[PDB]
Amino acid sequence: APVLSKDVADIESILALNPRTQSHAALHSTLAKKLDKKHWKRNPDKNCFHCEKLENNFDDIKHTTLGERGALREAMRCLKCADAPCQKSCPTHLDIKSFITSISNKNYYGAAKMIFSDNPLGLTCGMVCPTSDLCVGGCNLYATEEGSINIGGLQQFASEVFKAMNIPQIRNPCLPSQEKMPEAYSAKIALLGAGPASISCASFLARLGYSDITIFEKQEYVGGLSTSEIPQFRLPYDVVNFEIELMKDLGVKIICGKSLSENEITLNTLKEEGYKAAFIGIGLPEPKTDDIFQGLTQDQGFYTSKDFLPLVAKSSKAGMCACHSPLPSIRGAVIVLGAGDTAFDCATSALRCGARRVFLVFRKGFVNIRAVPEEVELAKEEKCEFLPFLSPRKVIVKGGRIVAVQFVRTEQDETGKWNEDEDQIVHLKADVVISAFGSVLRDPKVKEALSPIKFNRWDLPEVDPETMQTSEPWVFAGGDIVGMANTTVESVNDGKQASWYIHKYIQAQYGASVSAKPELPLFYTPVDLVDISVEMAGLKFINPFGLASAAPTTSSSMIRRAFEAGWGFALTKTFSLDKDIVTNVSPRIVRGTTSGPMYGPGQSSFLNIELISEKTAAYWCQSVTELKADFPDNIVIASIMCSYNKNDWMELSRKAEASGADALELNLSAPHGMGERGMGLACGQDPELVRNICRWVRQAVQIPFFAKLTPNVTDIVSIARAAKEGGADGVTATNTVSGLMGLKADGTPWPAVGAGKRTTYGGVSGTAIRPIALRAVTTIARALPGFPILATGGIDSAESGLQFLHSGASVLQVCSAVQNQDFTVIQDYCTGLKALLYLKSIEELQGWDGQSPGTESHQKGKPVPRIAELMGKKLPNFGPYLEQRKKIIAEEKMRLKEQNAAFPPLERKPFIPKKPIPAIKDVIGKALQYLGTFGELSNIEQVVAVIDEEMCINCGKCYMTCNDSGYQAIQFDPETHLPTVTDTCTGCTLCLSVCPIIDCIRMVSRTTPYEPKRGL
């Protein structure tokens, strides 16, 4: 037959682009290189001066937006620091460490709950916060080459997933029923203006239990600037609606078309109507004007930011206003005056209206720009021109329209004073002029309505910076109107701050006092009501998470703090009789090398050569008595160890039982014998020894006890069965895996002890051994149905915990995840498990995998345009293909503009459980039904790989894996770098396994009878 070990022509051809080591240096002329470079170009071209058409294009342009794949990577990178500087730098004091930890553990619900607990507008802020000047500006990772964490994008992602869950906010469960609430909580409360400040203030007051809260809004739309001015391409209106509805879930009422103004609503009319407190959150309603613009109209081409931005918003935000308004017709050159946030949004928004060119003109220099670099970047990347040191002097109008603006030179002299040079002028041609000089409060009727509160020299309501209280005790203020806040988050914080003192004030008015220490409630939803208790071997666990017998339980004081944090149970470090006292060596605990040279958070494993507790049995027994006395509902299991001696095991187990331990855990690590009988050296490796030890203990104590099994055995089931036959009430699976973590290049080990640099085999723990522990738990669960199992081995999240429950375990022990972090992870594990169970009752979310929404086609986490004009056209996101995609998208936007139509956000409506929420007992062992022998697997129902071209990032890893580890079934296009799976695919699934994009490749049922390649 032909040469079997040679590729035929067809395969040789398919392997054309497969990596091969070159034996010589390559030769390619500089000219050839210049001509080839443009074909692969991904990023902006420095030599390109035009901005892709953006007319009527309101797609998200934020650089911080993240998809799940990207969010998980960034969340894992976060160091999750103690006393985190990022949190200290966040105006609402968000517990960034905790919410990012939750995201890293795939607990998006927990992350969102943490975010909204401190910031009711968590999604809006995640999208618009100028992080470089806030939280991110203080991030410790700024001290690394890779840089600071994208905190805003992470916050946005978790909040977006929560929004998708369609779960409502609920009243505080710890609160008395509505009818049992003191009279004071029915006090009529009024807030003016429905912006971030009032929304936040009303939200917190509602959390506190106040039942009569009304926000009076002047306009017909709600959300304040988030709605009327911030562009849709930075902050989607549906986000604002989402946060407003969450607030309304608490009973807050909003009345539009009502203004704080003389002859309308005034502080006097409110007081007269019985309102007990009022919060002023009307912001700065008017534009800062300039004499040189007097009399100019929109028809001539002049707008203040207050005129222009709301026009664009009303036209691009479906759901904002009830009308359908065409977009402002901005043609020609546009001059935007100013250098604050507003100026840049006017510049980018002008492009959406059709502007041919946009000039951002400021009276100072580049160094003096007010907006954060990230905001400036957006206008810069869209090719807006920047003209520094120019002050407006005259606007030229001809034929009823603006045609130019004359400026004068500005300059800083020595003394630092900014001066204008009359003799140095600039005549700039322009068709449209937009002033972005800021906003103010001027309306005499509005100010009069605030009588008689004191106004400062800035002509703004004066308030105490700590209480947000005005000169009138019952009146408070916050947000832009106070003149301190520069952001949405600070305005939110102003309302938050004010809510506590408004509460204090109202309570006092009803003769009631409040805690000296501020106690604003957290954010709650129905998920928090989910019961995650479980019963095992006659013991009641408040939650299935506990500390394994290990470093985290080195001292009983640590267990106390763990219980205080919320852990369901805990194991004492293994202890023994005085005669068996041990002494540890050092170093003894090292990081795993199981996932490469990655240091810091999330070590994939640890290796330890630590012995049992160095503390005495007397210490542990007295400690157990104390712990059980102070934490009666938290389970305490005493871990004990003796040599193979009946009297010892009986003596120690009885001492532990007498201390008040809920149960005992038998550590079977003690040696015995020679070592060739095929059953190792430890007692736990010999069924006969295990059976006898359990018999001795069963005979000595009445409380339940579990045998902790080692995975270092041929058949762990035989050991489990022996423990059961001996009388054990269950087994703990499993202890550490024996191993050697590695050696340095010189051959010395790590850990290395003493001058001799010696070491001994240690135990591997962590996620790296989870596959071993998961197998152990499932095999035991299948062989001994109903026999209690306490799982241990790489549990580091609610998700992984649920995997073990599904595999047959009743409770979950943790060590490494805590060594990688701290005791507070229990908060993440509990909210995470509640969410996973809750979601199982929601019919409309069945397509999700736990808390992960079904993956949708995207690029950089942003949804791919499903335009018929782009589908199947094989247009990669680079070079000339990218240009084509941009042209097609632009044309689509123009078409959407011609056919003015749409507005159905189909009002937000919460999903309701359509079945009982599963209890832990309902999920235990549910995965066992899928496990079996290889013979039970169908070899008829085969699959093949299918690639989603739209999600591909053209790396060719699928191609390389199939070539050198598969069946050479993928074609990799030499021009587009797009892969195509051919009919020779066998469905091995390696390509999907190495793809960097989650769900880009999927395995689907084969459409033709499969035929094994026999080579023959």
Next chain:
Amino acid sequence: APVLSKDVADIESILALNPRTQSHAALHSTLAKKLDKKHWKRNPDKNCFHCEKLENNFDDIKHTTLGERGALREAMRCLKCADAPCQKSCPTHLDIKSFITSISNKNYYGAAKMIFSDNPLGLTCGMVCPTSDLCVGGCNLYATEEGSINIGGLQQFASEVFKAMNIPQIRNPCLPSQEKMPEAYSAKIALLGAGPASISCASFLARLGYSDITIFEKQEYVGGLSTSEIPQFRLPYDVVNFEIELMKDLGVKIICGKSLSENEITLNTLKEEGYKAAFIGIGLPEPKTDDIFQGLTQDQGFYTSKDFLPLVAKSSKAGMCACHSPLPSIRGAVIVLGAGDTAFDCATSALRCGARRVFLVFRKGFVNIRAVPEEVELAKEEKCEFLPFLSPRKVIVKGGRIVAVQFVRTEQDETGKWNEDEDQIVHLKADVVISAFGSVLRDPKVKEALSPIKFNRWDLPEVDPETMQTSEPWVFAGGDIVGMANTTVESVNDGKQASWYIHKYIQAQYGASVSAKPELPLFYTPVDLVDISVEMAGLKFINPFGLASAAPTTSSSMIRRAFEAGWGFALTKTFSLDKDIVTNVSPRIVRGTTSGPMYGPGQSSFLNIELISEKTAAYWCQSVTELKADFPDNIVIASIMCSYNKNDWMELSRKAEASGADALELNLSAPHGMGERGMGLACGQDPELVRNICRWVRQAVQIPFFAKLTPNVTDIVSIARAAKEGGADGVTATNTVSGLMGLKADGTPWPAVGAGKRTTYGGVSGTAIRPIALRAVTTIARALPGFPILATGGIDSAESGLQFLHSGASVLQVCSAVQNQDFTVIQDYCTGLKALLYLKSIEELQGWDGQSPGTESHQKGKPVPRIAELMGKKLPNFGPYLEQRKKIIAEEKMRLKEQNAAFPPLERKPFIPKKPIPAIKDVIGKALQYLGTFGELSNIEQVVAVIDEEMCINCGKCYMTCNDSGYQAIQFDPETHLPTVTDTCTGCTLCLSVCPIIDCIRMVSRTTPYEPKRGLPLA
């Protein structure tokens, strides 16, 4: 006794900043927050308009510089793409995929070798290449939120490590001896100008074997613009010297003080002197001038970039010149005219000279700036002011000094053209003016020296863009002088391109032809001569790396390509007799979840439920015959499997032997007949069955055979011993670990097969099982000294491979590392192992760990200034503390400027092996001496953790780990966020294990005797 389970006051205090979940929302006023924010500030403050003192400060300001920690992370992130677009976008076509792969595997030598093979100025380019407009601009990862790879910084890092190794370049090993070289290679070759272009050209010609190469340089210094103008704070002079010395290692001669000029060296004098070929690489020697600056002197305050930058370079670059040069005195406001690379370097350099303020003024708009964004960013972050649309008209001079510059306004019209508005002027005050209008070749004497070559309409030497040849056959040109190159890398490529055709031309002149296909040699060093062959069980392996019996050996055609790539040996996929033919299911191979939701490169493991080969024994046996016929020196081992039947094992083993296999590997995964004793179910789990199977095969064949052991046993040594007693020539340790990779939230498994979404236990492979495999190999090696062991289990680099060799294995099998990449990793493994062995002979590098230099105090990978006024001040790199550090550093720079000196430049000298380079046989089992029982470990020689404040990034992880997983022995300062290990430390070593900064924490011998905490006195 007191409450034992409660922390006493002092511990409660130490735990003050320990994480605790809050039960209520926090309350902090907006004002309080505004006041607290400045204390923790890390990045630049947007409201800061002032320029931090940079006078005489030439510290590295590149944002791309990487330290080992950072380089490893970035290298692992790289997708190591096929037909990589980054490489296509690199002017010198560097194999970025390969060099980055080597860095991720800790093989810095291999990475540097790959880099220098295609770019002789690899270090300079790593530091100065405008990557956003080159390699990085085409990076596939740009399509991800985290963004493109820092290719330049990675190149810089690998090259810097190689530079530190002090290893010389050597002549091409496959070249005939110097004496046996054809006469043509002695042809006298001349190159004009010692810049990137000529250095590259001379280097490649030298690689080809030419022995008489001379570069004539006009100045007294070498390196061209890299030396004379690129700032020391972007490109250290020692980098240039390094690359020059590497070139000189090949025999290239450099003569300074010699100019290509009519009254000196000309093409005619060279031809007359017998030179056979000449390369013109003199760049653009003169500044582009403007009539408005006529007559202005430096004393008045005027400089062209050609006057200014060299002055700064000569004073800041130790070694450049023989005389110490003063730093130009630039005081007051400085105006830099232009928007190209030069303008920005003039602006930043002006600040080092003491400028109070710097204005970058250009005649076009911001969008029209020529320099890449990264270059612009440096001037921007240093507070340089930018003034667009201004064209210079007059330099106002009063009192013999420039006091201002008058400009006119500019603008683009309705067609794109640019105009100047006379009526719109600007009068800008300034004390110094620096024109950065570019450079040109104008000297008539230099042009005349190039007669009679043709010049184009641009007034530059004309050359064929493919051959770099001028109108005169024996004269070539490249670099800036040609006018196409815009970068160092392109100039380097011009010289590279030219070397091949210069070679072709010279050979032809001597009546010899050259290959139609270009064959420039790679870069070589003594490391490449290191022997990594090894003998085991009577078999000779050219190198210890081979493909394990697995997916990568699914087909014999794949093994062929693997051998073509360089793999030492390979196992066939396990095959059997026709009656035992199997049929796979799908899906069957999935990624590991052992290191979290990290997708793409470097999966920490894989799980498979694949069976043995679906191809017949006939296919495999014929394939083995073919492979051994075509690759006699590559070892082929046939993996076979039968049920527990004597006749079957004897039949199959004989069939495999008859095919010509060098040896056999027995797969012991076949089940037995009913159990009876936690003896698993597979033959490989029962010593008795293993012994019998090996006995049957031993009686059947004469070639060596190895038993592949499963790690899924209580005592693997008992199985290894059984195989030995049975007659096996060795054992393969080990096969995959039994496991379940995971379940989806709905409880279904992955892999999930069929409509029933079923699965079965699979085998875990990859780095996640390496600890298990390493234990297996070491225990067998200790129990059966000298018994051959073939290692398998997480081997993915030369470094990890050496760990197994040290543990007792002779050869190394690989599977997962290839599944994660491709066959070309063998190149990294071989150069990596050669480097590791070579370095063991270098006495001056004993403090290194393999290829890793000892870690020094760094922040962001940049050396921490060892200033007396900083060490021990407890000044973290943030908030007010950072301000103080900067003030101290600035004062130090001023003192160095005043406490003058700096003639100590070194005499670059290669390290020479001071002992024989170890062979593989010399390292095997060397680690065993350190392994023993727990009782053999000293409990007297204890250690404690010690933290290097200067390397700390204030995360508090050490603190949190000791608090909830240790002994509450670390104090974490509430103001500086600096940790301090106290005397209660027990040396458990957890803090060091979780610290994100490599070597920030170190374990040191306890200075006080250790007393175990018993909690309660022992009675």
